[PDB]
């Protein structure tokens, strides 16, 4: 029932580059760069990791506490995540620094171009778990976002020290962190998550065997981009499983990771919670921006049919029913 | 004395990485980019070329209308200029879009990197400058500043059709531009202003010798960075200027020409005009950002001084007085 969403909070402002970036990084001077695109668009759009979750989480009708450092511009966005049942009492406002910032533009292709000011993001250090856990109680799991660095292993100590799950979700630090830095964000997870490619990284960064990692961790989880995921526990059960089919980029690896898990934190399977998972990232995939998308009981229904079978849909609306 | 800044309004967001930009390009894949920083500030500041040209000459003392398209979130900006003495009734507020928007991130190096979305600057083709003739008469100077393309040559054709004299200052569209366009940007300027990269870049895509140039033009301005400026009439006359020595990148350009034309346009002379031009570059150059900078007739005074002789000085400050 219970997860806590601790990770990054951001508002998250787009562009779009009509022509392609290539085709000026091509003659460029790459170690004096002057690069400037003329974009056609620009969005502004409520952000961070902790936060796309979060509300997917609620949006999906499960009990989510959003555990996220922030600034004071902050009241805007929290009133929004409250609204829809996320509960964030345990945000922390800053005294001095704004909400951290994201600021990407794409291309036709579509590469990323992307800058992030962290703003009241490194603050996320001098939060305890504990004071959460007086709060609400002590949650099924800590979810532990792309956040600020020193943040991440505190939040990853501090659930260790109190037996709390755990679902490592490093994907932005692991080309910023050591193979030391990043073992150390995932011993007893509960959950793992990666792409494959990220994955990789990982195997070789950390030094470790596909097997010790799987000893430490529960749950390997492993997005494929238009393949799917490749669930695995320890003991080799493989459950494989495709994609909605497509037909955006930010948010969608988020999105995945909060119907899979409220799909899982409401009783259902590895696999009808990662063909939920799914479902999730394709909303957002089909959504103007990362969380200006309608959860739908029946459009899911009619939806997750035509993907995975009929005896497949009803029982994960019967579960969000 | 009166001069009409018809160029670009912005509002620019600027970022600083303190690593560098090169050492993530030398091994990225540059066909299919997935570029991100990791910024440690975030400032916000009034933009846009025909806007820092305006608050120079305002600030410098001089008469200047701002001729530039823009949107409705322009009340604080306008109050902002209006209060120093810009003369902002000929602005054009848009209906549908909002004031163009430039975003810079900036390393140690310092290489730039930045996207520009226009917004409402692309009305400013439905603009007439007679409609400003009429209002306040016909100006001593209309400066065709980086702007939206079919408005700068709307508004260079326009100026031609009604013997206005005008000051090419097309930096920005070079790049993007043709040799035919470009050159139907420069023909009977009063006044033509580049850096010498941009007027090789400029004589190779117009075909032109440097020679035919000076026909049709009256007045070659070409700053060198580090080294100056080099004023340059037909009949030859090359008179150099060095700078007041640094010791920020944005706005430096337009406020060269600013305290320039200024400085002529309160009857000093090309040197003189030049020197005050290189006084206001590094009053940029040493504030904030781009318009957060103080004139003070007493600093000016005595570093124009240290940069040029105690004659130089007097006679600028004499005018400004
Ligand atoms: C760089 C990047 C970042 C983007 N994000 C957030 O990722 C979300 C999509 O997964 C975006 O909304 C962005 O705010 C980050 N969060 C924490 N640390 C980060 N460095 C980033
Ligand atoms: C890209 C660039 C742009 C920056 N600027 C403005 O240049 C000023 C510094 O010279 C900045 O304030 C920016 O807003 C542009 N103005 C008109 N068209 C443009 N494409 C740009």
Same mark, same amino acid.
């Given at each position: ?49 902790? *936060? ?26 929290? &009133?929004?995540?409250?609204? #829809? ?27 990323? +171009? ?14 305890? +778990? ?45 080309? #910023? +962190? ?9 011993? *007893? ?40 995921? &490749? ?40 696999? #009808? ?29 009619? #939806? ?18």
């Amino acid at each position: 029932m219970t997860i806590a969403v601790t990770g990054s909070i951001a508002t998250d402002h787009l562009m779009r580059f009509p022509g392609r970036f290539s085709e000026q990084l091509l003659p460029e001077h790459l170690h004096k760069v002057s690069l400037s695109f003329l974009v056609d668009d620009l969005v502004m759009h409520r952000g961070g990791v902790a *936060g796309n979750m979060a509300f997917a989480i609620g949006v999906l009708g499960g009990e989510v506490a959003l555990v996220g450092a922030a600034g004071a511009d902050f009241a805007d966005y929290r &009133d929004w995540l409250k609204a #829809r049942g996320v509960n964030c009492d345990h945000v922390l406002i800053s005294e001095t620094a704004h909400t951290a910032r994201f600021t990407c533009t794409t291309d036709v292709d579509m590469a990323q +171009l992307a800058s992030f000011y962290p703003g009241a993001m490194s603050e996320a250090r001098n939060i305890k +778990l504990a004071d959460v856990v007086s709060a609400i109680g002590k949650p099924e799991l800590v979810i532990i976002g792309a956040n600020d660095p020193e943040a991440m292993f505190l939040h990853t100590e501090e659930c260790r020290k109190l037996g709390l799950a755990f679902a490592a979700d490093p994907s932005q630090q692991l080309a #910023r +962190l050591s193979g030391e830095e990043i073992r150390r964000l995932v011993n *007893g997870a509960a959950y793992l998550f990666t792409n494959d490619y990220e994955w990789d990284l990982l195997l070789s960064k950390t030094g470790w065997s596909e097997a010790d990692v799987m000893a430490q961790i529960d749950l390997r989880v492993t997005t494929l981009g238009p393949k799917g995921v &490749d669930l695995v526990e320890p003991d080799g059960t493989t459950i494989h499983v495709g994609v909605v089919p497509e037909t955006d980029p930010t948010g969608v690896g988020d999105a995945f990771r909060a119907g899979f898990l409220t799909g899982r934190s409401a009783g259902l399977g590895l696999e #009808r919670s990662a063909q939920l998972g799914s479902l999730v990232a394709v909303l957002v995939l089909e959504s103007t921006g990362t969380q200006e998308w309608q959860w739908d009981y029946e459009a899911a229904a009619s #939806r997750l049919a035509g993907a995975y079978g009929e005896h497949a849909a009803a029982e994960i609306v019967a579960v969000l029913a």
